């Protein structure tokens, strides 16, 4: 039971998938060639891997993942790497020519070309699950296939699968740095068309994770390998109440009902507290209440917007390690007494707790410390209403002179979809306003 079908899309999605699936192989017993070291028990000893790994007859475990891209050069070091024998070859879908930072190329022209091939592969992985909790989506708004085809993945998921839970992690574009020039046209048009189709949507951006690896860990110059390692330690802590023994269990269904109050507002923000270096855990005792306070800290946040600008609509705390169910209570009661955190008026209950026994795993040659307790957090805040205002700013900028609009009009797409998907977002800017008013 408890199966989860991971869907990775884009070069960002593939390179995040390579980080997570190395973590999952080490977390259970799996080698890089599929096999366990021999189980040395009677029959099947441990069946904990069934949420992520299947099993053939012979003793080979094949992941429940689909790796999607439109450029061939990203999957061809998954196919000829260390983990080239773990993946069944047909799970890794490549195109022949990529979407080239166009939403329109990735939605109408090249994405429709490749949609029905990968919705045959997710049928086969969803007919192997006795109980399916829900999918996972790993994308980035910036690219063509990370925005265009990913937004059309969610739309044809809603037709076929109904009200099945479709989570998504995302790389929202950064405020100061940026890869590309055409990213506001991409990022606006996909938040408009995934808006009624997605259940939940966690966001991080790469500039904030830059601020932690340089500062909290003692690793100057972090490559994307060090950022992708931290993303796998959030996905693992979301799904470790499904595989390892817990005191309080949390599913993948208890996040949408506890952080998404209103239909247009499904945008929580991730945080992970004891990300620390091996020279500076020789000195610090990591208690249960010492790592609770450091999910609310604006430095240790994982997006480049301060929660103090807004109001905490809810929370979701994920405690992982050697904790006590009483010292979880002994820290939450403290946090509510500060006046530098401010819960919204119509949420007097606030929280959602989760306690799990298996401590977080040490990857050989990784970044962090061998730590005995940890906390993950997904919190939903009104302080994201400052993030679309820096995206309405850079859409209306290049749209009032209509730069780059010819690269989307002749690419199979009419032009009135530009001047309505920024009007559609214009209600969402006032919709985040009225939940910021107190009920006088």
């Amino acid at each position: 039971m408890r199966e989860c079908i991971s869907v990775h899309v884009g070069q960002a999605g593939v390179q995040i998938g390579n980080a997570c699936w190395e973590l999952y192989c080490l977390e259970h017993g799996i080698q890089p060639d599929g096999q366990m070291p021999s189980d040395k028990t009677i029959g099947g000893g441990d069946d904990s891997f069934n949420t992520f790994f299947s099993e053939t007859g012979a003793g080979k475990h094949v992941p429940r993942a689909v790796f999607v891209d439109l450029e061939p050069t990203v999957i061809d070091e998954v196919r000829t790497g260390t983990y080239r024998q773990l993946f069944h070859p047909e799970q890794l879908i490549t195109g022949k020519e990529d979407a080239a930072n166009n939403y329109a190329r990735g939605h109408y022209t090249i994405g429709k070309e490749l949609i029905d091939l990968v919705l045959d592969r997710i049928r086969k992985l969803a007919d192997q699950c006795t109980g399916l909790q829900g999918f996972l989506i790993f994308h980035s708004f910036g690219g063509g296939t990370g925005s265009g085809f990913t937004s059309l993945l969610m739309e044809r998921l809603s037709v076929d699968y109904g009200k099945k839970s479709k989570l998504e992690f995302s790389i929202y574009p950064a405020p100061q740095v940026s890869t590309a020039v055409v990213e506001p046209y991409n990022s606006i048009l996909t938040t408009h068309t995934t808006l009624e189709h997605s259940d939940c949507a966690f966001m991080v951006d790469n500039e904030a994770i830059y601020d932690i690896c340089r500062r909290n860990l003692d690793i100057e110059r972090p490559t994307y390998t060090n950022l992708n390692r931290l993303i796998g330690q959030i996905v693992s802590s979301i799904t470790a109440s499904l595989r390892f023994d817990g005191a309080l269990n949390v599913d993948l269904t208890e996040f949408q009902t506890n952080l998404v109050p209103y239909p247009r507002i499904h945008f929580p923000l991730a945080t992970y507290a004891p990300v620390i270096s091996a020279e500076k855990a020789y000195h610090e005792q990591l208690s249960v209440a010492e790592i609770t306070n450091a999910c609310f800290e604006p430095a240790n946040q994982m997006v480049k917007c301060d929660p103090r600008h807004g109001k905490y609509m809810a929370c979701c705390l994920l405690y992982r390690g050697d904790v006590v169910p009483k010292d979880v209570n002994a820290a939450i009661a403290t946090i509510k007494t500060k006046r530098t955190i401010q819960f919204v008026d119509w949420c007097p209950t606030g929280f959602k707790v989760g306690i799990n026994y298996q401590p977080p795993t040490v990857v050989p040659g990784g970044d962090l410390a061998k730590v005995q307790r940890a906390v993950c957090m997904l919190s939903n805040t009104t302080a994201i209403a400052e993030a679309w205002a820096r995206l309405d700013h850079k859409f209306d900028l290049m749209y009032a002179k209509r730069a780059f609009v010819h690269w989307y009009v002749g690419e199979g797409m009419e032009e009135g979809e530009f001047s309505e998907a920024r009007e559609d977002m214009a209600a969402l800017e006032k919709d985040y306003e009225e939940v910021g008013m107190d009920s006088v």
């Binding site: 109980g131 109050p261 006590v324 209950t349």
Partner: protein
């Protein structure tokens, strides 16, 4: 002869209901395998109240372990007492609730209610004279509160004059382990008003205020907080199982507690718990079991009776003590401190003496008290419902299963009536 068929629902019910069969089994001399290895004949004389007979001289409980996703019953099966349960008793679905009441009540639970009421109907009709059922569940969750009210609703229409108990775990006043708590707990007290015979309220901070302040446990898990719930699930049902100088079954405590039928929320306690180094300092007499039943800090309900008036009182005793001394203290606490007792009942306290103490203990004592200081448990859930409800907070997760908006209106207003129904007597 006076059988009690146990029920347990959800990830709170299957963690309360797993330790309770580890406190009854050793109370009666039952191994992990199931066999009887006892050192008396009272350990086997009245064992049919809880244990069905199996083949070969082996005993099996009447537990109906219920869940909406079987993850939290794989851990129960792998414990030290996981093989004692008949595996047909496990009821489980595929996808859970998500801490949503309607999904547990109307949508996903209702597809699993007809498989439960085959199991209880196979056991309620395999009793010589069934006395009544139980239920261990939590109001904060989705399948404890959600379908666990559908169970009481659809068995009060099939066995309507037996006993139906519930050991609730109603939510907490400081820290709430689910955002959407006041929608679930308001909508479920409203069901329990017209559908239970008794119901005990348990808050989880009042269990924390014992194991830190009194038991002196530096690291109290929920193992040592389920062990306090299961040490008063057996005090209420002892005089059935063990002989007495004065007896009290479940009905007699029900008769002598409720003056009006809407008023059946109680608050438990348990006396002889003591700290680590203070066991050699303890005096061992009878009036030091009356000190700790009645001490206003050790109720399991997080509602101090100093705000309220004791409508009735119970007391169940375990040991070979004296009937003059038991009755002397009930005259004592009623006649020193008589601003906490109602006036139109001249003796509020019901007493009962079992004879067989818990193993290792020389005496023991259990309490149940019906108060007007328990309507403040129902005020606090009301304003956190009607703050959350007047701006239509989480309602699309609930109305999107097809609910009505005026159904929330009565479950507010029925709970507003019992708030003011209790409040006449203060």
């Amino acid at each position: 002869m006076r059988e009690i068929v146990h029920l347990q629902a959800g990830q709170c019910g299957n963690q309360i209901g797993a330790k309770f069969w580890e406190v009854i089994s050793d109370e009666h001399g039952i191994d992990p395998t199931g066999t009887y290895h006892g050192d008396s004949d009272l350990q086997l004389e009245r064992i049919n109240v809880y244990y069905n007979e199996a083949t070969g001289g082996k005993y099996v409980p009447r537990a109906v372990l219920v869940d909406l996703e079987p993850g939290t019953m794989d851990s129960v099966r792998s414990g030290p007492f996981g093989q004692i349960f008949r595996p047909d008793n496990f009821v489980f679905g595929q996808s859970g609730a998500g801490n949503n009441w309607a999904k547990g009540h109307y949508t996903e639970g209702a597809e699993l209610v007809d498989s439960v009421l085959d199991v209880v109907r196979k056991e309620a009709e395999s009793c010589d004279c069934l006395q009544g059922f139980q239920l261990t569940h939590s109001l904060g969750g989705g399948t404890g509160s959600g379908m666990g009210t559908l169970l009481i609703s659809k068995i009060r229409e099939e066995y309507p004059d037996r006993i139906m108990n519930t050991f609730s775990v109603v939510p907490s006043p400081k820290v709430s382990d689910t955002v959407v708590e006041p929608y679930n707990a308001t909508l479920s007290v409203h069901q329990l008003v017209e559908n239970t015979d008794e119901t005990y309220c348990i808050d989880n901070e009042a269990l924390y205020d014992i194991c830190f302040r009194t038991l002196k446990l530096t690291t109290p898990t929920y193992g040592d907080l389920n062990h306090l719930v299961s040490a008063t699930m057996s005090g209420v049902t002892t005089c059935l199982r063990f002989p007495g100088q004065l007896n009290a079954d479940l009905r007699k405590l029900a008769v002598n507690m409720v003056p009006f039928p809407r008023l059946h929320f109680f608050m438990p306690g348990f006396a002889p718990l003591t700290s680590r180094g203070s066991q050699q300092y303890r005096a061992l007499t009878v009036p030091e079991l009356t000190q700790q039943m009645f001490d206003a800090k050790n109720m399991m309900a997080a509602c101090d009776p100093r705000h309220g008036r004791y409508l009735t009182v119970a007391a169940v005793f375990r040991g070979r003590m004296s009937m003059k001394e038991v009755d002397e203290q009930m005259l004592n606490v009623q006649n020193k401190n008589s601003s906490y007792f109602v006036e139109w009942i001249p003796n509020n306290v019901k007493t009962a003496v079992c004879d067989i103490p818990p193993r290792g203990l020389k005496m023991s004592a259990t309490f149940i008290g019906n108060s007007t200081a328990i309507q403040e448990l129902f005020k606090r859930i009301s304003e956190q419902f009607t703050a959350m409800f007047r701006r239509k907070a989480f309602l699309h997760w609930y109305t999107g299963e097809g609910m009505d908006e005026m159904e929330f209106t009565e479950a507010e207003s029925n709970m507003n009536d019992l708030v003011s129904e209790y409040q006449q007597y203060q």
